[PDB]
Each structure stands twice: as structure tokens, then as C-alpha cells.
Amino acid sequence: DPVAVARGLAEKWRATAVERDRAGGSATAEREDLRASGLLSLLVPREYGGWGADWPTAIEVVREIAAADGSLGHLFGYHLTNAPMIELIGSQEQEEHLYTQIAQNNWWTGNASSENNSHVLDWKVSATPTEDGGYVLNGTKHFCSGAKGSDLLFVFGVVQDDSPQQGAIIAAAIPTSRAGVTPNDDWAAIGMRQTDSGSTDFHNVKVEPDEVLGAPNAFVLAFIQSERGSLFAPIAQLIFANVYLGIAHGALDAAREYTRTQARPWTPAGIQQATEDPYTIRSYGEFTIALQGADAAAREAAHLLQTVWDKGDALTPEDRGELMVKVSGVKALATNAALNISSGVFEVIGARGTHPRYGFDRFWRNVRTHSLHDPVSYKIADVGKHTLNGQYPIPGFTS
């Protein structure tokens, strides 16, 4: 039972949660806890030595981790999205080989893939074709996800060459240890402090022909067609949404423990028990109700993702558009609820809860930081276009 294991880890990590958030840097010990749990192979099919969990289950595990630790929930969650990329645009052979390696070695996968807000011809990583059919990568991917301690790195380069392949996005899974590859200890933010999201430098990094995933530009092709690879954004976006919800629960659970044990009643109002204050009770109702709505919608969306996933290549553009719209909604609901709860929970906690030893602002800092990955306003607009005009989002990395 993967969820139970996550629960186990969450208990272990909670004793160091405040300190780790304060220290920042890499959460090396905890990453190792995860590796030892066997959880890294959660979505790898059983036949290759994985758990073969479904998306709903996998998302529950993400949520557990995110509640204990935003950074870890993001690290793990993003790790999960990587390997599916193989099933999505990679060959059958690449699929057997890579899934087997990840599962057998308990590999951390890492990401130096999309530049979500740059034209391909401006991407900072070039892929220059070699005559043996591979590529060499050069430049700095400024925003990465868990490249730093990874074993297998998923990288995108752009042929910026005046090749006939010019502007093609090249996807590859290469060892992080390969010469030329330098994941920097580069990451600094007010929140998500231990997500290892700094830059990686690529210096004449060779990509072997069999390390290349699908044809040149295979991702962009899959998007335009709404073929199976277009499931990328829906998957990443739903994981993110559920990280936020996990963080919201964590903040709410922390708050209530505190309210029960440490919070003092406002005596000038004649209140004798903090847990009996009518406004404190109302606030807890409102937090819970916001989560109840957002969680239920996230679960629907997870079953929908499963259904679409199980259709394999027979999925329609409508299937994927409907799923993306659903997920856009969840992303919005989760952003708004996690921000509101993470900040709001202070009101029922009181002045003493502002002490650094509680680290109570960490839940907000975590959500506030990652929720800026891609603008929630366009998630909302995409839902509105669909409701009003029947339009589907333009498939990309974030939609």
C-alpha cells in the first residue's frame, strides 16, 4: 500500500519540517528516504518491476507527501511525470529498457525540459545533430526540476542550426552523470526552498541516437494533433494542483492542532475556550468547505485522466480538451483554496503562532511560490472559453 508508506515517511519528515524549510538547500536525507521506500517506481508498470499504480493512487501519494512537505511533494510529483514521457513519445524498446532501469535501480528522474515562456529559437539549450544520428547539447537550462540529485535526466534541446531540422524540439533521457552535464546548486526562493529548481549547464553533452525520445519535434507534433503526448500538460497540471491541496491540508491540520493545544481564547470577548469561539469555528468551517469542493473536483479529474490514459492512442482531441478544461478548473480551485487557507489559518492561530519555531508561514510561502509557475488567470480564461464558446485549450506544456 503506497499511500501507507507515504504516511510513514510523512511522520518521519514532520519532526524536521521547520528546520529544513529554514535551512533550504537540498533535502538529501529525505530524498534517500524516498528512494529507500521504493516509491520512485510507483507509476512504472509491475511487469518492469514497478508498482503499476493508477493515477488516482499516485496522486494520493503525492498529496500525502505534499502535506508533510511542499518541496518534497513537488520533487516527487514532478519525478512521477517524467517517465510517462517515455510511454508518450518514446519507442516500445526505450520503454522496456528505461522503465526497467528506473524500477530496478530506484532512480530519481529529473527535468531540464520545457522553457514554457520562450519561443523555441530563443531556448537556451541547443541540440546540434551528429552524423551518428545523436545530438550534442549546449547552454544553460535556467529553470529545472530535480536535476540536481537525479540519476536519469529528461532534457529538451532545440535545433538552432540552420539544419533542415531547425526549430525542432529534441527530447532525450540521458544519465545526469554524463560528462558536460552540471546541475548547479543554484536554487533560491521564498518558498519551495528544497525543490532543487536551479539551473543546469550543458557542455558538449552527447545524446546517443537511442537516447532520443521519438522523432525530432515529436512533442510539438503530438500537441498539434492532440495525440497521446498531449497528455503531458493535463498530467503535470493535475499533479501541481494536488501538491497545493496537500499543502492546504498540511496548513489546516497544523492550525487545528495548534488551536486545540496552544491557542488562547479572546477573554475581552468573554470567550473561555478557543475551540468554542464562534468565529474560530466559522473560519475552520470555511477552510474545510473550500477544500471539500476543491478535493472532490481533483478526484473527479483524476478518474477522468485515468479514463483518457486507458484509451491509449484512440483518444480524441475532444477527450484531451475536455480533460484539460477539467484540470484547468482544479488548478484554479486548488490555487485559490491553498492560498486562502495558508494565509487565513493565522487568524485562528493567534500572535504566538508567528514564532519562527512553528514555521507556520511555510505552507503559504510554498503555495505562493509554485502557484506562479504558470498564470492561474489563463487557467480560468481557458475554462471560460470552453464554457462560453466550446473552445479547447491550445495544447502546449502548460495547457
Add this chain to the structure above:
Amino acid sequence: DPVAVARGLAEKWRATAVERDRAGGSATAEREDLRASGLLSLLVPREYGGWGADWPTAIEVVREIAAADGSLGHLFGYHLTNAPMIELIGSQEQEEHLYTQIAQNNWWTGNASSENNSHVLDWKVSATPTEDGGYVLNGTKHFCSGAKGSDLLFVFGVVQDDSPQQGAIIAAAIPTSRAGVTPNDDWAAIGMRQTDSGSTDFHNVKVEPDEVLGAPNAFVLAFIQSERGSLFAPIAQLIFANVYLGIAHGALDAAREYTRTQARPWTPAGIQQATEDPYTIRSYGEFTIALQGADAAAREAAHLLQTVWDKGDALTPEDRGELMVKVSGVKALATNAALNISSGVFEVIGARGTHPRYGFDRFWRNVRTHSLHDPVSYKIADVGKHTLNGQYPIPGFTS
């Protein structure tokens, strides 16, 4: 397929929706459409001639109707809650007889039951015990639900007698046509104008021994014990929440049709197409998202209600308290979303939409009216008490 039948009725009723809201009075024709549909016996088990539908399905049907017509959705929905009251506190024999009569005759059931905000000793309807073991009812039930056109009336009387039964609530299912029973044409409100929610007068109305449902005070007993009869409030409240969600969908669908065909763009802002205005698109996004969360939570709650229902007498006080807490949340989400959408939809409709021929305010008036049945603030407080203190609601008619 009961939902497809409701859809068919909804199509019929939409042509008259504006006129009927404006006229008020009883929706006699439509009530007859419902009777002829067979839908009245929707929750009567198949073995008695009913559809034997589950709760989730019955709630979808309520939703379809509520989207076309809030009053009808409430009338039908409240009708559904009545017969289960037989299975809840009635005998097995009463069960077979009454279910069979309802299903065979396509009976409308009606309600002159609880006074939700009065002490039992102040209730306006007395039940005076007769020596044959029945009772006589006297007084006026000021707030009823669909007594007016009903065939079978569910009534509560209080022994206000200085009997040894004093203060006991007596529950009975009697024919509405019985002598002494006068459902008045009494109902006036700004919304829910066709719900027939006026008073009914009782004058030396005889209740036969086999028309009495369970022991004296059987309802109050079931509440204190959290036995099966305590399922009443969760069921009624979930139905209400779903009526609101239906209305919210009705308002939203009406708005979008209008925005697509009638609305004009704000030219001073350089907008050429109303469906391309970025704030109009955002607003539609928000309405959709608010509904997405609340609908998902209502669905969960419906499955939970099914699970608890299926436990029969084996249900724990915890089963029932958890259920009621879930339902309280739904009731809050639904109220808030229906109100916001119902009023907010005008912004994307424009000035011309205010013309009485569209009846666009009817959705808001409907929700605004029924949402006051019991205070949403205590639904919210009940959720907060559970989250913060682990307390369950005190079982009653509305909690």
C-alpha cells in the same frame, strides 16, 4: 432512464418557465406532466411497482428538473423525501401497503411535518389520542411543502395533552382528501413561487391506528440514538443543495445562450465580439469553476448517503454524523455558488437582459428564497465544530 425522462419534461417546461414564474400560483399542468411521467415513484423499490432508483440517480433527476424550474425541482425533491420516512420509522406492513399505493396510483406525496424552529409544546398542530389507538389532529401547519395538490399527506402532531404521551411527536401518513384537512392556496414569496408552501388547517382530522408511523415520538427517539430515522436531515438537506445547484446550472446555461446570441460587445473598449471579451470569458470561467467544485462535492456526498443507506439498521452514530458533516459542506458550497452565479450572470448578460420577458432574475429569486429555509451559517459552524473539535451535529430536522 429516469434522467432522460426529466430532460424531456425540462424541455417542455422551458417554454413556459418565465410566464409561470410571473403568474405564481400552483403549477397544475406541470405537476400532471410529472405524474404522467411515472417519476413520482422513482425511489419506490421495483418490487412495489417503483423504479427502485439509487440516491445518486434520484438526485440527478432532481437536478434536471431544478435547472428548468426551481419550484418544480423543490416540489419533486421534497416529495421524494416523504415516502422514505415510511421505511425509516414505519412498520414493514405500512411499508408494503404505502409504497404500493404510491407507485400504483402515481401519488403526489405532501408534507405538513416539522416545525424546525419551534419547541414541540408550541407546535400549532395537536395530536389528541383516541381510544381506538389513533389520534385527532387540530390546528394550522403554517409552513408546508406540497400539501396542496397531494394525495398522501405526511403530518406531525404533538400530544399537547397532559397525556402520559405529552410532547411526543406523532407521525402519520393520511389521505389529503380526508375530512378536516384544508391545504390553503396561501403561498406568497419573491421566489419558489410555485412550490405550494402555504398553510394547511386541520380540523378534528382522524388518524387511524395503522396510519400512525412508528411509536409515539419515534422520530425524536431515532435522532437521539442516531438510528436509521436520523437519515432524514442528511437526505432533505442534500436534496436542497442539489436543487440550488440545478438552479445555478439553469442560470448559467441561460446566460451563456444569451451571451452567444443577444449580448453586445462593449465597443468603447474596442471589443468586437461579446464572446471574446476577456472579462466576460474570465467570469464564465469563475462560474464554471465554482460549480465544478460544488457539484463534485455533492456527488461524493450522494455516494456516501447511498453507502450509509445500504447499511440499514447497522449504521453507527459516526456514519450518520460524518454523512451530515459532508452534507452540511455541500449545502454551504451550493448556497454560495448558486447565489453568486445567479446574480453574477447579469454582468455578462448586459442591460437588455433585464427585460421581464427573459425572467433572468428568477434563478436568483428562487435560490435566494429557499436558501433561507435553515441558516447556512450553522451548516458552516457544524462543519467547523467537526474539523476543529471532532463534534457531530445534534440530529434534528435540519441537522
Add this chain to the structure above:
Amino acid sequence: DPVAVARGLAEKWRATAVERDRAGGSATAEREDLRASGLLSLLVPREYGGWGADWPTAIEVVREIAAADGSLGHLFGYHLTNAPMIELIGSQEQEEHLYTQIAQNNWWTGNASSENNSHVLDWKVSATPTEDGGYVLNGTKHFCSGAKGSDLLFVFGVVQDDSPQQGAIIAAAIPTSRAGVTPNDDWAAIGMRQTDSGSTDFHNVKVEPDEVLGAPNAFVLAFIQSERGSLFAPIAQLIFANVYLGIAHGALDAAREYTRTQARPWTPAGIQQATEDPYTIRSYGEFTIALQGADAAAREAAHLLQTVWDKGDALTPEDRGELMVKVSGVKALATNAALNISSGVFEVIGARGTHPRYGFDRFWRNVRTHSLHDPVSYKIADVGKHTLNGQYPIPGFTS
């Protein structure tokens, strides 16, 4: 003291407020009450027989009236904007003559002026030049303000002629009684039911040379230049904002009276006094605070309007742009607070308040209807463009 007179009228009108809202049609009696009060000449300078009140005072009067009656508040408020149009783009001679007539005769002024969302070449009222230097008007102004019972009609025609004046907006003040002028009894809406906002037909209506206000296209010229005439939108928009605030106070005052005298406490929660319910108290807190901020902003904007007004022709485009931005803010604050309060007030009133005899939904209906005159989204955008980019709104009828 014009405010004390408004208070006096408000007392008189409150006895009939419910019935008049229900009846619709013209508020003939009440319009006469206003005429007899002498209040119609409120903004006419003392030297012409007027009260010569300043803008802050005049707005307080509008607010008093709007609290008693949304339709009348709008009727009166819009009347006030009309005559200033004379000082704005009319001659000194037209000024002395017309002001004197309005004040001596206690004239109602009415409006068949701007089509806010139509290109000038599509405006339904043509002004065809006559050789004596006047014009003839033809066509139907579909949306008017208080043309129906007016004495003096402010009308715009468009030379749609292939004149050399083609596309020029011609402003005239003519007697409503002139032959050809037919203000129809045409107005139907869910709210603002007695504002007489129907159409007026023009049939070869003669406008004499000295009835023409300013040169041809004088209004459009004043906007482009941000000259004194561009003060029109800021004035009208601030009047509207204050109508809404008036309505919001009317709802809130009505609610509180009801809560104090009629509302019953929620006994299941152990509440004994409705005025002692903590959530009821909180809600009144929030309504008050929302109004407190909106009102304070309204007053500031009114003093700013005075300051700019007093500058006469020396006003800068900056003066007028800053003013419009301030007013745009008030418009938004007022719309949002009036809608929220008008609907929210039902929560603290309870189910019985839904009875048509209280007409409690009239406040919301009135705000909900007029607030759609011009889109609040662009009032918000105009404030944002100013804050972010230093841009001023493009002068027009509504900005």
C-alpha cells in the same frame, strides 16, 4: 437645507415603496412631490432662481432619495446631470435663459441623448439641417431617461446626411411637448421599474437655431480635447455610483429594522435573541464596513469633482483624467458593495422576509438592473491602466 427636504420626501415615499415597485409604471405623484419641493433647481445657480448647491450637497440629496427609492434616485440624479450640459457646451445666453426657465417653472428635465454603444452613423435619431440654421429630428431613441414626464428634453441627433456636417452630433434642449415628440410608456425591467426609461419617437421635430447647444459635434470636440464638456461622464458616473450606495443603505436599514423587530433566533443553535447571534452580528459588521469604505471614496471623489468643476475652462486633461479614474473606482466600489449587501441582507432577515409584502428584493433588483448601464469590468480596467501604465480613460459618454 435641501438634504432635510429630501429626508422629508423619503419619509413620505416609504409608505408606498413596496406597492409602487410592484405596480411599476410612472411614479407620477412622487415626481410631483419632487417638483413641489423645489429640488429640481438644486444645481441651478442662485442668481437664476436655483439653490446653487455644490456637488457634494447635490449628491447627498440624490443619496437620500435613492435610499427611499432607487427609481426616483435615478430619475432625479439623471435630471441633475442635464442642465450642467448647458453650462458645458451651451452659450452664455442659452445658459441664462434655460437655467431661469427651469428654476422659475420647476421643470423636470429629461434625456434622449447618448447611444453609448453605437457608432454615430448608426444612431437611430437623425438631425437634418434646415436653412434657417436649425434641424429636424427623425427616428426613435430607444433608451431614454425620464423623457416621459419631462418639460425640457435634451436630445442628440446625428447629421446622417452627406451634409458637410455628416457624423456631427447635434445637441439640443427642446420642450418635450413640441409636436412630433412622443415619449412612449415603453419601459419594462426587473428593477428601476419607475425610471421611465422607454423609447421616444421623433417625427419631423423642429429644433430652432437657438435651441442648438454649441457648434455641431461640440460634445465630441470637448472629449477629444478634455475641455469642460468632458466633465459629463465623471458627473453622470459619480451620480450613478451614489444611487447604488443610497440603495445599499436603504437595504441595510430595512434589514436591520426587520432583524430587530421581526427576525427570530435560530433556536437549534441555542440562540435566544436574533440581535445576539454572532454570525448575524458579523454579517452586519461586513455590510457596514463595505459601505464605510465605498462611501468615504465617493465623498472624496465628490470633493475632487468640485475642485475640477471650479477650475472652469482652465482644467487640464490630467485634471479630468485623474477625476475620471477616481470616479471609476467609486463606480466599482459602489456596484460591488450594493450588489453584495442587497443580496446578503436576506441571510440576516430569514425565510419570512421573503414575503412580497416586504418587497425586500427590490433593492437588489434596482441595483442589479442599473449596474448594467455600462460594464463595471471596464471601470476596473480603466483604474488598472492608470495605476500600471499612467493611462487615462478615453473621454466619452461613460468614461
Add this chain to the structure above:
Amino acid sequence: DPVAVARGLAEKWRATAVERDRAGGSATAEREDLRASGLLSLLVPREYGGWGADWPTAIEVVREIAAADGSLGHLFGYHLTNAPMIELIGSQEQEEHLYTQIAQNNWWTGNASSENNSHVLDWKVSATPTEDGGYVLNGTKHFCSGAKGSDLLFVFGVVQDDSPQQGAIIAAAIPTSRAGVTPNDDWAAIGMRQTDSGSTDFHNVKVEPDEVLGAPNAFVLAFIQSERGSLFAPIAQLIFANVYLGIAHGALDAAREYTRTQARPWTPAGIQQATEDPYTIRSYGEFTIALQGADAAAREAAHLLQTVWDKGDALTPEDRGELMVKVSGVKALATNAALNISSGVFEVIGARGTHPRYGFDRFWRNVRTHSLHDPVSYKIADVGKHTLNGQYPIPGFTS
């Protein structure tokens, strides 16, 4: 011009704002900048060598400082409240002497006064009367305001003696340097990191008879009576509110600078200029409008404070209750706007703004921390009680 001097200081401090927030500890340099400005004597009457500024001006100065630095705005603002305490309950002689010392020496005043949520008999600082007519203080004041670097310390002790003075609150102004007085370097919080809000220990600290302000329990007497000393809470609370508004402007100004120079447009939506994004523009509109209303309310309340203040001892319990109600509103408006804007600003800033070198979360951390000083829910409930029941807040330290 005191505001211009504050502006000058604000410029100096902005270069170090990020680093200081990150470092925490005492803002020693900046405290000295303030001392050297002469601003500490801002509210000391001219006749004693002070600036004799009015409250509206003094509040503007607090606002300027708070925009640059939340901690400093709070430190300075709280300092301002202290000396008035002399004019409030102190003697005329104490007034001349103390005002003159503060102005001539440019003293920082500090506070170890009220325990806002403790019964007097549970207060941690005892005042034991001496036969020379003074007192000795013992115990730890756990929550102080700027006691650490102060020259003049305002202290409250409670006779916990079984004296005849038992339970009396003793107010004194003593030198912080006096033996027995130990302001600790004790303060740790997620925000307001440089307010020096730790504990001070008192150890057989002598208070001389002429260092005691007013009679024993003079503060509590002034509250019950609503005499001049009851102005304490309105003053403190209005200062707090304006500190929040200052911080809200600082966040908003910082955000707009960033949006204009650093922010990148969301290209997948076809946006080419960040400052032309319609949702970014709308967000700026909403932030501005929220402040526009709260600022306008704050200024009104400042003039009302001036008016009441100028009534000297002739102020009525109504005067003071109306004031406190107004101020409660502002406190609520300011809290809500500063929290919403401080967090919301990230959405228009984008992912890169999360870098610690911008310290963008400092505005939120500052508001989030101080806004918990006393519960905003009871500020809201006190407004609601006044609106609904005509009740005035019970005068105390926070109401």
C-alpha cells in the same frame, strides 16, 4: 514638512530593506536616522520644543515609513502613541516636564504596558507600593513594543498585593536605563522582524511618586467613564490600520515597478507586453480600488480623531464610541486589503519575483504578523453591534 523628511528617510532605507528583513535583529542604524530626523517629537506640542503636528499629519508620516519598512512604521507609530498617554492620564506638571525631555533629548519612547488578553490579577508585572508613595515593579512583561532601544519606558504594573489598592493598574514613565529593567533581545517572528517586540524583565525596579501617571487604576477609571484616557485604543488601532495601509502601498508600488521593468508577458496567450495583459491590468485595478476605499476611510477616521481630541475633557461617551466604531471599520478594511494585496501582488510579478533578493514576501509577512495583535473578527463584530443594536464597544486597550 515632516512628511517630506519621512520620504527622505524612506529613500535611504529602501536600499537596505531586503537585507534588514532577512537579518532581523534591531534596526539600530535606522532608529538613529529617525532620532536624527527630529521626527520622534512629531506629536509633542511646539511649546515644549516638538512639532505640534495634528493626527492626520502624524498618520501620513507613519504611512510613509510603513511603506518603506513595516517594522519601522510599527516602531515609530507605537512610539507616537506613548507620550499622549501623559496628556491623557498624567498631571499638567508631568506633561510639561516629560514632553520637554522627549523633545529636547530626541528620546525614543518604549512600551511595556498592557497585557491585552490577561486578567489584571494574572498580569506578570506586579507593582508593590512603597511608603514614599512610589512602587517597585517585579516580573517579566512578555510582549513589549520598542522597549529595547528606548530612553523613556511606559510601564504598567498591577498591585497584586492584598493592598487596599489590589487589582489597580499602575502606569509609570521611567528611564529604560533604571536599574532592574532588562529589555531582552528576545523577539522572533516571521514578520515585523525589527520591531523589538520581545520581553522585558523587571527586578525591584523603583518607580518614584512623580513617575506614576495619574491615580492608581486611572486607566481603568478613564475607560469605564469614557473620559479622555479612553482615547487610547482608538489612537493605537488607527496607527496600526495605517501601518497596514502603508505596507499595502509599499507592496503595490514594488509590484508595479517590477511589472514594468522585469515581468515577462505570457507568450502562449499571445501577449507581447506584460503591462498590456488584460488580467494583469484588472488585478492592478482591484488592488488600487481596495486601497482607495480603505485609505479614504482611514483619512475620515483621522479627522474624526482630531475633532474628538480637540474637545479635550468635554468629549462624550458617544463621541468616543462613534470614533472607536469608525476606527474598528478602518482596522478591518486595512487588514483585509493589505493581506489581499500583499499576497495577490505575486500573481502579476511572476515566478522570477520569488527570488529572495527581491524580498517580495516581506510585505505579506509583515501584515500577516501584526494583523494578529488583536482579532479582526471582533473589530468586525463591534461594527455590527453598533449598526444593528446601537451598542458601543466596551472601552479597553484594544476596543
